[PDB]
């Protein structure tokens, strides 16, 4: 169970340097001892080795320069969780501190002087080319512009923002996973020995999926840090890249002045479920390293990330005790909805890509949609959509491009509810779509009702006083070898009951919160073309989204901001539960 991980993209691999990650409760004395054990063992086999850095604070482990011949030996070491081969990354009121991991910076530019502090942390790979020389270049450009976009006097988003610079990218805008890791551990160690003030970390870089980089980000996020990253400039799924793929970081895609996704030569902004939202990222005026009062127009998802870091810094100067869940929910709440032209993205990536462009704001129930990864084609394969630790799973739906689904279940897994979608016999696979909310003094629980084929007992509701129905899930309960017969719908009397087939188990989300008020809305078309829609009004938050009738006419259903969308085949109805506080 001690595994070896290398980058999927061969040209971005950096063999010779390896991150040895140890098990969770490994003390510094054990990491140092394990590092020395590797050196001694390697020397016994006649190999020089160099322990570049011993990790402590963010994760237990060490960084080692050695031959790949010694891998099988290092995987046999005690306490090892996994070994990851290093790879390259590339460039893409209260006082809040914004950490910037990027290039060097012109700290004396008028746009950012007095607001930027150069930390002296420096960790970059050597530049490519035997005769490469910076000469009159100060390797300032990317970093200076981004510090300006975050907090520049005249062209910045959060003009009143403190910033701290760490050099993790060289003159060619290239860094390593190992160097970024060390920069994140620096930030953590600063947090421990310094204040209890809000921290924003801007990671305007991207590399191939990295198990260790994503873990390091997850650890800083759980310690209360707000990480904002570029989605990537590869016109590709951001789940294949890191830190983009890490679910705890806030991944930002780039859009232009005509609300189009940004094009960068033959590539452009990344897309898909791992992108939290989009922001301005084309022709962005910001500080230029050319002179202390110069400006310059740049484009990319790092520009887009800097806008969100600015917005976060503004939000945190106002409410400094705001949690990361609260901030992500607020970022999504205030963004412009359904303004992006989704034509530019691959057709099968549009549903999964959010239609949100960031914006500043001008108690309350906030919900966001969380899409799962696609399940496999196995008939018993499942997809899982998870909420953030602080959030409630208020509803769970599913969707298949073929419509071959068994339904879905809101079930406990590791003490927390998850939205599990089940594939059907002969199905290509399915998606699970969670609706994750922040509800004040909520006491929620899911109640499972059984298949109801008798003439009574069909009505499923939150029969408990003070508990209100926020969402329904339906799971088909007839065996694949049993005689199939057309599903029969459970009748409708009361309006605030689950909708579903008599042959299915129903999972009801019942919440008890002080001023929680929840209602059902419907809208059906007889022979719909592609879809049916129903939306919560201004002041209401979509909590649940279900479809009617079953598989025969429907591919699935999913929330899209406050609109419940039901994807029909060639009387289809969209049933939505709209909820609100106080």
């Amino acid at each position: 169970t001690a595994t070896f991980h290398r980058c999927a993209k061969d040209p971005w691999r950096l063999p010779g340097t390896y991150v040895v990650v140890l098990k969770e409760e490994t003390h510094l004395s054990q990491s140092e001892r394990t590092a020395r054990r590797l050196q001694a063992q390697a020397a016994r086999r006649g190999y020089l080795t160099k322990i570049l850095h011993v990790f402590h604070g963010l994760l237990p482990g060490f960084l080692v320069k050695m031959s790949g011949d010694l891998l099988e030996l290092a995987l046999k070491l005690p306490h090892v969780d996994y070994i990851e081969e290093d790879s390259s990354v590339f460039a893409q009121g209260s006082l809040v501190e914004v950490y910037l991991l990027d290039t060097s910076i012109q700290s004396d530019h008028r746009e950012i002087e007095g607001r930027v502090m150069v930390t002296d942390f420096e960790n970059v790979p050597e530049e490519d080319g035997t005769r490469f020389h910076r000469q009159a270049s100060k390797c300032d450009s990317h970093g200076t512009h981004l510090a300006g976009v975050v907090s520049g006097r005249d062209a910045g988003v959060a003009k009143g923002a403190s910033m701290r610079s760490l050099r993790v990218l060289n003159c060619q805008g290239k860094g390593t996973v190992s160097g970024t890791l060390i920069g994140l551990e620096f930030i953590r160690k600063s947090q421990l020995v310094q204040p209890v003030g809000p921290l924003v970390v801007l990671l305007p870089l991207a590399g191939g999926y990295s198990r260790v980089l994503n873990a390091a980000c997850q650890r800083l996020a759980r310690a209360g840090v707000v990480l904002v990253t570029a989605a990537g400039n590869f016109r590709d799924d951001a789940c294949l890249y890191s830190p983009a793929s890490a679910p705890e970081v806030i991944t930002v895609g780039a859009t232009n002045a005509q609300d189009q996704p940004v094009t960068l030569g033959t590539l452009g902004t990344n897309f898909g479920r791992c992108v939290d939202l989009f922001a301005p990222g084309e022709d962005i005026i910001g500080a230029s390293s050319d002179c202390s009062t110069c400006f310059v127009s740049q484009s990319g998802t790092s520009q887009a990330a800097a806008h969100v870091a600015g917005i976060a810094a503004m939000m945190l100067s106002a409410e400094p005790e705001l949690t990361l869940a609260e901030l992500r929910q607020r970022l999504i709440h205030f963004s412009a909805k359904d303004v992006i032209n989704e034509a530019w993205f691959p057709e099968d990536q549009r549903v999964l890509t959010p239609n949100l462009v960031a914006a500043l704001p001008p108690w309350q129930l906030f919900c966001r949609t969380v899409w799962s990864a696609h399940s496999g084609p196995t008939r018993m394969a499942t997809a899982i959509a998870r909420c953030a630790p602080d959030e409630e799973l208020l509803s769970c739906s599913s969707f298949s491009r073929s419509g071959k689904r068994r339904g879905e279940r809101m079930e406990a897994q590791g003490g927390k509810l998850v939205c599990r979608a089940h594939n059907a016999f002969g199905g290509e696979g399915v998606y699970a779509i969670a609706r994750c909310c922040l509800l004040p003094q909520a006491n929620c629980s899911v109640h499972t009702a059984p298949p109801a084929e008798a003439s009574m007992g069909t009505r499923v509701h939150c029969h408990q006083q003070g508990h209100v129905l926020t969402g329904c899930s339906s799971h088909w309960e007839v065996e694949d070898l049993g005689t199939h017969k057309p599903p029969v719908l459970r009748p409708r009397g009361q309006p605030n009951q689950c909708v579903g087939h008599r042959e299915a188990s129903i999972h009801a989300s019942c919440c008890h919160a002080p001023g929680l008020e929840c209602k059902v809305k419907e809208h059906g078309i007889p022979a719909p073309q592609e879809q049916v829609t129903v939306a919560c009004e201004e002041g209401w938050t979509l909590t649940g989204c279900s479809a009617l009738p079953g598989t025969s006419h429907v591919l699935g259903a999913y929330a899209v901001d406050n609109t419940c969308v039901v994807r029909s085949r060639d009387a289809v109805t969209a049933v939505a539960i709209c909820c609100r506080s106080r």
């Binding site: 062209a155 002045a257 301005p280 962005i284 005026i285 917005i311 462009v357 960031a358 500043l360």
Partner: peptide, 11 residues
Amino acid sequence: XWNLKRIXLLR
């Protein structure tokens, strides 16, 4: 300056 107008910072 479209970017700052777009995020509701300038009118």
